[PDB]
Design an enzyme around this catalytic site. Structure first.
Site, PDB file in Angstrom:
ATOM      1  N   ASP A  54       0.878  -1.191   0.000  1.00 58.92           N
ATOM      2  CA  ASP A  54       0.000   0.000   0.000  1.00 58.92           C
ATOM      3  C   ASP A  54       0.909   1.234   0.000  1.00 58.92           C
ATOM      4  O   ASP A  54       1.601   1.530   1.048  1.00 58.92           O
ATOM      5  CB  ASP A  54      -0.905  -0.010   1.241  1.00 58.92           C
ATOM      6  CG  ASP A  54      -1.767   1.274   1.348  1.00 58.92           C
ATOM      7  OD1 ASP A  54      -1.867   1.973   0.328  1.00 58.92           O
ATOM      8  OD2 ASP A  54      -2.377   1.497   2.473  1.00 58.92           O
TER       9      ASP A  54
ATOM     10  N   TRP B 239       4.301  -5.592   8.210  1.00 59.40           N
ATOM     11  CA  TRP B 239       3.048  -6.282   7.964  1.00 59.40           C
ATOM     12  C   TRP B 239       3.273  -7.418   7.075  1.00 59.40           C
ATOM     13  O   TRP B 239       4.198  -7.295   6.263  1.00 59.40           O
ATOM     14  CB  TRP B 239       1.742  -5.656   7.780  1.00 59.40           C
ATOM     15  CG  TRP B 239       1.700  -5.042   6.372  1.00 59.40           C
ATOM     16  CD1 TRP B 239       0.940  -5.544   5.311  1.00 59.40           C
ATOM     17  CD2 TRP B 239       2.463  -3.943   5.782  1.00 59.40           C
ATOM     18  NE1 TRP B 239       1.158  -4.811   4.164  1.00 59.40           N
ATOM     19  CE2 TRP B 239       2.057  -3.829   4.440  1.00 59.40           C
ATOM     20  CE3 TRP B 239       3.478  -3.096   6.298  1.00 59.40           C
ATOM     21  CZ2 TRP B 239       2.571  -2.804   3.657  1.00 59.40           C
ATOM     22  CZ3 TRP B 239       4.017  -2.092   5.461  1.00 59.40           C
ATOM     23  CH2 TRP B 239       3.528  -1.963   4.151  1.00 59.40           C
TER      24      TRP B 239
ATOM     25  N   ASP C  74       8.408  -0.275   5.538  1.00 60.06           N
ATOM     26  CA  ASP C  74       8.350   1.120   5.012  1.00 60.06           C
ATOM     27  C   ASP C  74       9.696   1.778   5.159  1.00 60.06           C
ATOM     28  O   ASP C  74      10.473   1.527   6.115  1.00 60.06           O
ATOM     29  CB  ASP C  74       7.290   1.869   5.826  1.00 60.06           C
ATOM     30  CG  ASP C  74       5.867   1.443   5.423  1.00 60.06           C
ATOM     31  OD1 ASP C  74       5.647   0.748   4.368  1.00 60.06           O
ATOM     32  OD2 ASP C  74       4.963   1.866   6.165  1.00 60.06           O
TER      33      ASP C  74
ATOM     34  N   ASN D 157      -3.038  -3.045   6.023  1.00 60.43           N
ATOM     35  CA  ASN D 157      -2.047  -2.159   5.319  1.00 60.43           C
ATOM     36  C   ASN D 157      -2.413  -0.689   5.130  1.00 60.43           C
ATOM     37  O   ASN D 157      -1.742   0.005   4.378  1.00 60.43           O
ATOM     38  CB  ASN D 157      -1.606  -2.822   4.003  1.00 60.43           C
ATOM     39  CG  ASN D 157      -2.616  -2.730   2.866  1.00 60.43           C
ATOM     40  OD1 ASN D 157      -3.597  -1.964   2.930  1.00 60.43           O
ATOM     41  ND2 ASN D 157      -2.378  -3.512   1.819  1.00 60.43           N
ATOM     42  N   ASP D 158      -3.412  -0.214   5.889  1.00 55.08           N
ATOM     43  CA  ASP D 158      -3.541   1.281   5.877  1.00 55.08           C
ATOM     44  C   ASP D 158      -2.642   1.950   6.944  1.00 55.08           C
ATOM     45  O   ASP D 158      -2.491   3.181   6.897  1.00 55.08           O
ATOM     46  CB  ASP D 158      -4.985   1.750   6.156  1.00 55.08           C
ATOM     47  CG  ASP D 158      -5.998   1.121   5.169  1.00 55.08           C
ATOM     48  OD1 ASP D 158      -5.721   1.104   3.968  1.00 55.08           O
ATOM     49  OD2 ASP D 158      -7.039   0.676   5.643  1.00 55.08           O
TER      50      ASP D 158
ATOM     51  N   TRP E 148       3.368   1.850   8.833  1.00 48.42           N
ATOM     52  CA  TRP E 148       4.251   0.952   9.605  1.00 48.42           C
ATOM     53  C   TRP E 148       5.675   1.491   9.681  1.00 48.42           C
ATOM     54  O   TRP E 148       6.624   0.819   9.267  1.00 48.42           O
ATOM     55  CB  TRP E 148       4.209  -0.429   8.942  1.00 48.42           C
ATOM     56  CG  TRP E 148       2.874  -1.170   9.223  1.00 48.42           C
ATOM     57  CD1 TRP E 148       1.900  -1.515   8.300  1.00 48.42           C
ATOM     58  CD2 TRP E 148       2.458  -1.702  10.477  1.00 48.42           C
ATOM     59  NE1 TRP E 148       0.913  -2.260   8.971  1.00 48.42           N
ATOM     60  CE2 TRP E 148       1.244  -2.340  10.286  1.00 48.42           C
ATOM     61  CE3 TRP E 148       3.025  -1.676  11.786  1.00 48.42           C
ATOM     62  CZ2 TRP E 148       0.547  -2.977  11.327  1.00 48.42           C
ATOM     63  CZ3 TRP E 148       2.331  -2.326  12.834  1.00 48.42           C
ATOM     64  CH2 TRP E 148       1.073  -2.921  12.596  1.00 48.42           C
TER      65      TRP E 148
ATOM     66  N   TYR F  64       5.578   8.521   5.551  1.00 51.34           N
ATOM     67  CA  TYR F  64       5.660   7.430   4.569  1.00 51.34           C
ATOM     68  C   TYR F  64       6.319   7.898   3.294  1.00 51.34           C
ATOM     69  O   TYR F  64       5.780   8.786   2.592  1.00 51.34           O
ATOM     70  CB  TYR F  64       4.167   6.925   4.314  1.00 51.34           C
ATOM     71  CG  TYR F  64       4.210   5.863   3.280  1.00 51.34           C
ATOM     72  CD1 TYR F  64       4.456   4.542   3.707  1.00 51.34           C
ATOM     73  CD2 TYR F  64       4.119   6.170   1.889  1.00 51.34           C
ATOM     74  CE1 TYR F  64       4.570   3.495   2.716  1.00 51.34           C
ATOM     75  CE2 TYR F  64       4.243   5.159   0.891  1.00 51.34           C
ATOM     76  CZ  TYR F  64       4.497   3.878   1.337  1.00 51.34           C
ATOM     77  OH  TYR F  64       4.664   2.859   0.429  1.00 51.34           O
TER      78      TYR F  64
ATOM     79  N   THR G 278       7.640   1.510   0.121  1.00 47.45           N
ATOM     80  CA  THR G 278       7.600   0.218   0.828  1.00 47.45           C
ATOM     81  C   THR G 278       8.500  -0.745   0.022  1.00 47.45           C
ATOM     82  O   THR G 278       8.451  -0.730  -1.261  1.00 47.45           O
ATOM     83  CB  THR G 278       6.164  -0.340   0.803  1.00 47.45           C
ATOM     84  OG1 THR G 278       5.304   0.562   1.512  1.00 47.45           O
ATOM     85  CG2 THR G 278       6.068  -1.717   1.515  1.00 47.45           C
TER      86      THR G 278
END
Ligand code: HEC
Ligand code: HEC
Ligand code: HEC
Ligand code: HEC
Ligand SMILES: [Ca+2]
Ligand SMILES: [Ca+2]
Ligand code: NA
Ligand code: NA
Ligand code: NA
Ligand code: NA
Lengths: 376, 338, 131, 125, 376, 343
Positions: free
Chosen positions: C26, C51, C70, C98-99, C102, C113, C116
């Site tokens: 994500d 995740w 991330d 995955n929202d 992380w 963010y 990923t």
């Protein structure tokens, strides 16, 4: 042929089949070289912005740098660092303003200095590369201030400190020629030579007026600090060249980038960084198209290439996209960079044949400025 | 031929108290096959010999991290060097020198027979060759399948022969997503062929001294255990207080835990990691004592980047991690889990 | 291109949103902003949190656990955006969600963010999601 | 449509980039984020600085001086973006130059660009 | 027929011809009313974001509010204020983190409070409306924290001060029912009632477990604070309704938004805000489409309308567009709002006929969250 | 009515019989040869400077606008609603005509037979025997005369240029452009937006731009060192403290020929008046020094209610733009006063 994503898939699949381990980690960018190219996205005046670091040979993003509102990027010609002057606010686009300079290591991209500029003194303007500029030794950064009056700020990058504001006449842009000297272009149509000290009124001298008040000199001249060569087009594609190499201005013959037949049929330069100069070839490249006289910031689809010494046209390339900015790498067989603000894509061409070789897309919201180092 | 015979000689040595100072104990006394080669009954806790043969020889990798070796402080390069160290170690077999070992081997006709068939006639009359051969045999024995059978529930599930329970599955998922996998997995990425739940590195996780064990050792209250820095030839002060990452195979049956045996229950060892992450008052307290954990024995070089993960394990996740670590029990030791 | 169709993995281009290891990504693929498939770009900070998804690799027919990580501390890259949700569960099953940003564990407390990475960490599947 | 064609003013829709008063606008039209042709949106700060253009009004055939002002203190609106440069001169003639962020004088020292308004201040001469 | 920009041209032209003067100034937004609608743009995880304030009746942007990284908006039901919890950093996306709540006047859009939250306690996640919530009296804002553990922070909007963190069990989301009480949803399948004092660990009471480990409750349930009605769809469109109006949880009969036949043919809810609830009509609206079971965050092109009492289907609308989020205004003859993240457009529909009435485009980079006030 | 009423005002305007001791007329202080101002104040008792009567007839009557801004009126402090009320105040004002009362004015008017005829033809038989009617009629006449074309001809070079008859020089043109883009436009333009039909370069509002006391004038006035000129707050019936220190924005027409400048005549030179505004925007030490004295400008007489939102524009006028503004403001000189620009 095989794309970078495809090659990477083929490699990861071979690593997997072979049981090869590798540690997830922070990569280093490759060493700065003549084909590295930086693209800055002022993002149509957004409060935060981005710079993309690209390997022009591979057509690959190798890094990014975040910036605040309309920051001014510089790149040391010797590859040793990059830096910007930038502005943030305490609540996105409101609240207390802080302007500051950051210096970055060109391989880790980590800031090695963060130098606050007192009293929020930067000029906020759509980005003009020569409104913030390094001295040739890289030890000083000079930035322009417009309010309350034209002035130039002096930042000591070696000592990591702001030094002082210099008062100048009603002039614009900053082309440094020495540790303590730079030139500006004045409303009156002269250039001003400003030579300064740590304290005291700077010594300011003017050339004679070199253009009349109805001949308009664009906001994005090309300046090669290593050659001392200032390449300044007007709205019609007349090009002034000034040689600052001796430390005083000497003027070269003006050339026309367009023919009289072309100008009669509406050809004029237009875009953002409309002009580039290759120092070793002593060649000028200008973005041009057929346009109305007041569509001077629109994209253009052609680039003319001329010999700076004679004015002879050496080529006219059909770029095949709406191009707003150009620049060149300064190595022997250079790349011609063509950045489209509307496509958010950098197109990378062979500067000799004009052929599009590769492209890098997804470069922000409205990317406008290309900077390269002259390492040779 | 000699593969099998060499291990078989090591199997005989491993259970022979004649290898100890006063003929009182064997390697099996402290590393009992009935308890995953640990002690069912010195200041450091006796570690398992299971899966020790999968550890690489001690080295410094290209990023400057030390990896591999044997003992909690890595001071033996591999299992053969460890066995030689063990035979002369005051806290293991405690023989006074290599000649005393050779003399014990010479007293036993089956050893004259077994060692000469493998190393040549007269081997036991040369104390250096005799000792080196014994250490070679003890190392070969520990490299057999019996010490590393890869027959746990975890193994069976990874072979697709059975499934985790929901609780074991949750614990596996927590282990592989939380910070445990930064240190208790062999590789950085990819899939290991023979995972033993250790990356063989050296870390200081900031444990306190085990008071009662320290007192019973006779080392002195002023002793400090410096871990890897105590290995001869290591002088780097950044290694002070670091210990080898233990394999978690059979962990549920080899308490007590950590280099000094300071926690008796597997749950406590897991809760220890919440001291670096949780804000709750209870995270500061050792549940086995009701008191604070205690200050680190060595208050430098802690692996804070891995340990300060930002996330607390709630009791549901701790229950899940216990269930998952119990699936790493070799088949033969499953009966010990009740 | 039908966004509601069952996602079809490939193993031939890591910058595309249908690359098999991106089954529950994500955000943005790091290989498109100067990282690589399993490394962060310069200047960013690699989170320690993760995740997981069990993603089928169509090449070898095996399902691998991808424990996404991330790269934090920079504004979102804006290159190669993707969102897939194979076996993705709601936030109250966070190890599959995955929202969440992380970024826990990243150096310098970095929590914004940027992109990923998609490294393999096991060969396994899940009760709620198996091939 | 043709970006390089001479700009053609209209007097029938203020949200379009060819509205006659927008002849030297650079940024976003304030009527598209809660302001109007000549007022700023709530929460933004009206600058006192201006830049000028002479813009032809096709309704009455007169050219008017438009003294643009910015509404400042918010991130750029992102709605109705336009850039026109009728008579626009480079930065060393600032009274006709439109890359500058003309947020001077705005309340609370606001200097970020949100959108521009297009008021008339005179007939051209 | 006549658009807003055309009407404005005509008025301006009439003012000029009549010699009407007017003072350039900062406008006030029109009074908040039932048809005002807020659209928040998380901008696909950009470090700064925007909220658009829109008059749904006219289809007009009437104001904007800037926000930091993944802020949580809230709207007082009585129209008296709006607020958000937001996050900024000292150098765009790096450096010191500040989390804070701002409260805004709903007509000037000026901040009337800016309350720092200590220790950067916000949960950073793709935006979920019920991860930050107002108490019914407006005096208290509750926000969720995930690290180091599930927790809920209490912010006194009246005193303009952060109060404290409450430790909770392994639970998610915040549905306030009283000045001192809220409910959450727990990993174990229960809801937790959390009643909190001035000091004190809260009193926490669980309901019975109301769904199995393999039925998945989406991250965007609808919650009407005025009705005490929690509407919670699962991935299959089964809908849980929990009545919180007695102050304790009463589980209403479950209802299926899709038929068995539709579910066998692949229909499932999908998008972001998949579910809306109209309090006066006691009606549920659900975004659905034919999709694979793991495409639950893709846009849907249909809305089904059902009676919350009977589960009877009332309507099935073809929306005409790729829609990610829905909501409704809470007046009689409501509007059905249909936001597309991909088109960055809010489509405004008649809720009864489902017909598209008007639309508002250019709503940022990836708009996802619609909020309305229930003022009736 | 109209011609005749202004013609009667023309006679009064130059008649010294309307002054206390018959020593001066309106034209003494408001000298038609110097754009209706006083040569004696020039490089040629209250402490306010005598303002021009040219273009004063374009000022709206005094009123409070819906935003709470006062606008219009006459005198520097707005205390007369319009020209007629100003004339009646002027007749009785100790610093203008200084007659003691309305009866005294009516008595002077009766001494003159041409006035008995001219007033009676316009206002009726017996007008001059009723002091209230006589005095009101005289004020009305004076106001009518000031409303004639002669006082407001609109024949300056600026006017000729706007009509397309002439062009500005490049320096006058840059001056006009600066004027219309800098903060001057916020107070010295009739309208907030759109185009004025008869621009007089004032929005008729009341602002405090923070001027110091003119010490020599104040010394000479005999008002006292503790006097404070409160501007618009001194209008009877204005009680709001926010109006203290605010004065009516002057029309800039004929500004180049009507020095000295401001409500108290504190600056002799037009360039000094323009330079004063840089005290709110420039960082240079010279910006706070009055170039005519070489000393700081001085503390404002009234510290409060300054128009800082308009004045603190963030931008300093360089000398080039000061020169350009002087050139442009000289174009606002009526044709008949152009010879005055030389000196
Ligand atoms: C008196 C109990 C005792 C006896 C007998 C003993 N050991 Fe040990 N063993 C230990 C302790 C305690 C340690 C940990 C010592 C340290 O780390 O310094 C240890 C460590 C080891 C290790 C290190 C494994 C690891 O993961 O670090 C190996 C291998 C080992 N012993 C093998 C042997 C062999 C082979 C024998 C017989 C020659 C033996 N031991 C006899 C107590 C004993
Ligand atoms: C930074 C590396 C690191 C991390 C992260 C880490 N461990 Fe450890 N673990 C160790 C080391 C090193 C030891 C031995 C420490 C000592 O005795 O000095 C250890 C010991 C253990 C032990 C005791 C084993 C024995 O034989 O005595 C258990 C159980 C354990 N870890 C489980 C975990 C779990 C579960 C997690 C995640 C909550 C975790 N560890 C995270 C490095 C780590
Ligand atoms: C002795 C000099 C003198 C004489 C005689 C004189 N005035 Fe004045 N006049 C002034 C002064 C000084 C002011 C400013 C007073 C103030 O603002 O309080 C003024 C102000 C005015 C104004 C206000 C203009 C503006 O813009 O505010 C008008 C109108 C006026 N006078 C008309 C007259 C008329 C008509 C007469 C004859 C009846 C007259 N004056 C006689 C000195 C004189
Ligand atoms: C905030 C409103 C305001 C602004 C902005 C402003 N002025 Fe003024 N101006 C005044 C007022 C009020 C006066 C009278 C002040 C007083 O005497 O008390 C004045 C007086 C003057 C005078 C003297 C006129 C006379 O007859 O005495 C000149 C010249 C002048 N202004 C020029 C300018 C120029 C040029 C600018 C732009 C640089 C400018 N002003 C900006 C309000 C303004
Ligand atoms: Ca143990
Ligand atoms: Ca005067
Ligand atoms: Na103990
Ligand atoms: Na050592
Ligand atoms: Na004086
Ligand atoms: Na008064």
């Amino acid at each position: 042929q095989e794309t970078q994503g495809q090659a990477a898939a083929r490699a990861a699949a071979a690593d997997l089949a072979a049981g090869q381990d590798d540690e997830p980690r922070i990569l280093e960018a490759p060493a700065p070289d003549a084909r590295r190219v930086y693209v800055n996205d002022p993002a149509h005046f957004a409060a935060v912005t981005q710079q993309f670091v690209i390997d022009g040979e591979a057509g690959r993003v190798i890094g990014m740098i975040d910036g605040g509102f309309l920051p001014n990027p510089v790149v040391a010609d010797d590859g040793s660092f990059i830096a910007h002057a930038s502005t943030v606010f305490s609540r996105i686009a409101r609240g207390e303003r802080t302007d500051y300079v950051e210096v970055f290591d060109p391989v880790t991209l980590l800031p090695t200095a963060d130098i606050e500029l007192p009293d929020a003194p930067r000029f906020l303007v759509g980005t003009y590369p020569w409104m913030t500029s390094l001295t040739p030794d890289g030890k000083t950064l000079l930035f322009y201030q417009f309010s309350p009056a034209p002035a130039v700020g002096v930042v000591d990058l070696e000592g990591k400190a702001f030094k002082r504001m210099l008062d100048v006449p009603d002039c614009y842009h900053i082309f440094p020629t020495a540790p303590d000297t730079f030139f500006m272009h004045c409303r009156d149509g002269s250039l001003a030579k400003v030579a300064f000290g740590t304290e005291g009124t700077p010594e300011i001298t003017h050339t004679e007026v070199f253009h009349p008040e109805d001949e308009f000199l664009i906001n994005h001249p090309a300046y090669s600090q290593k050659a001392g060569r200032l390449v300044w087009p007007t709205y019609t594609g007349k090009i002034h060249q000034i040689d600052l190499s001796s430390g005083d201005a000497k003027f070269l013959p003006a050339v026309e980038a367009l023919t009289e037949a072309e100008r009669a049929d509406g050809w004029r330069p237009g875009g953002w960084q409309q002009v580039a100069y290759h120092r070793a070839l002593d060649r000028i490249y200008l973005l041009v198209d057929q346009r109305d006289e007041w569509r001077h910031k629109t994209a253009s689809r052609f680039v003319v290439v001329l010999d700076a010494k004679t004015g002879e046209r050496l080529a006219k390339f059909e770029m095949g996209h709406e191009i707003d900015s150009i620049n060149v790498s300064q190595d022997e067989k250079p790349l011609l960079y063509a950045l489209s603000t509307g496509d958010k894509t950098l197109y990378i061409h062979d500067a000799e044949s004009g052929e599009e070789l590769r492209s890098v897309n997804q470069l922000g919201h409205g990317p406008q400025v290309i900077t390269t180092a002259d390492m040779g | 031929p000699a593969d099998d015979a060499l291990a078989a000689l090591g199997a005989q040595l491993f259970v022979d108290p004649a290898l100890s100072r006063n003929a009182t104990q064997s390697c099996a006394t402290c590393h009992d096959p009935a308890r995953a080669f640990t002690d069912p009954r010195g200041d450091r806790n006796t570690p398992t010999l299971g899966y020790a043969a999968l550890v690489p020889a001690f080295h410094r990798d290209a990023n400057g991290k030390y990896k591999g070796g044997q003992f909690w402080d890595g001071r033996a390069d591999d299992l053969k060097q460890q066995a030689g160290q063990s035979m002369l170690n005051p806290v293991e077999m405690a023989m006074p020198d290599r000649a005393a070992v050779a003399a014990r081997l010479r007293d036993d006709p089956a050893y004259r027979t077994g060692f000469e068939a493998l190393f040549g006639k007269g081997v036991l009359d040369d104390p250096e060759r005799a000792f080196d051969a014994a250490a070679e045999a003890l190392a070969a024995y520990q490299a057999t399948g019996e010490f590393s059978p890869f027959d746990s529930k975890y193994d069976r599930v990874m072979r697709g022969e059975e499934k985790f329970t929901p609780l074991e599955e949750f614990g596996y998922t927590v282990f592989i997503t939380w910070n445990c996998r930064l240190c208790h997995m062999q590789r950085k990425q990819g899939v290991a062929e023979r995972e033993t739940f250790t990356n063989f590195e050296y870390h200081n996780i900031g444990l306190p001294v085990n008071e009662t064990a320290r007192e019973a050792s006779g080392l002195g209250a002023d002793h400090v255990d410096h871990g890897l820095l105590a290995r001869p030839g290591i002088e780097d002060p950044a290694q002070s207080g670091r210990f080898k990452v233990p394999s978690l195979r059979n962990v549920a049956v080899t308490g007590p835990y950590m280099h000094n045996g300071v926690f008796t229950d597997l749950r406590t060892a897991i809760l220890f990691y919440n001291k670096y992450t949780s804000r709750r008052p209870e995270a500061k307290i050792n549940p086995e004592t009701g008191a604070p954990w205690g200050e680190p024995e060595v208050a430098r070089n802690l692996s804070l980047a891995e340990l300060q993960s930002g996330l607390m394990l709630d009791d549901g996740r701790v229950d899940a991690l216990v269930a998952f670590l119990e699936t790493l029990t070799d088949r033969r030791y499953e009966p010990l889990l009740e | 291109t039908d966004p509601r169709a069952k996602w079809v993995p490939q193993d031939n281009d890591i910058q595309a949103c249908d690359y098999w290891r991106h089954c529950s990504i994500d955000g943005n693929i790091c290989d498109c902003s100067g990282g690589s498939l399993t490394n962060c770009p310069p200047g960013t900070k690699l989170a320690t949190a993760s995740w997981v998804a069990s993603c089928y690799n169509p090449t070898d027919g095996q399902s691998y656990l991808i424990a996404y990580r991330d790269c934090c501390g920079y504004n979102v890259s804006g290159r190669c955006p993707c969102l897939n949700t194979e076996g993705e569960l709601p936030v109250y099953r966070p190890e599959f969600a995955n929202d969440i940003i992380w970024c826990f564990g990243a150096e310098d407390d970095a929590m914004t963010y940027h992109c990923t990475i998609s490294p393999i960490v096991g060969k396994a599947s899940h009760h709620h999601h198996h091939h």
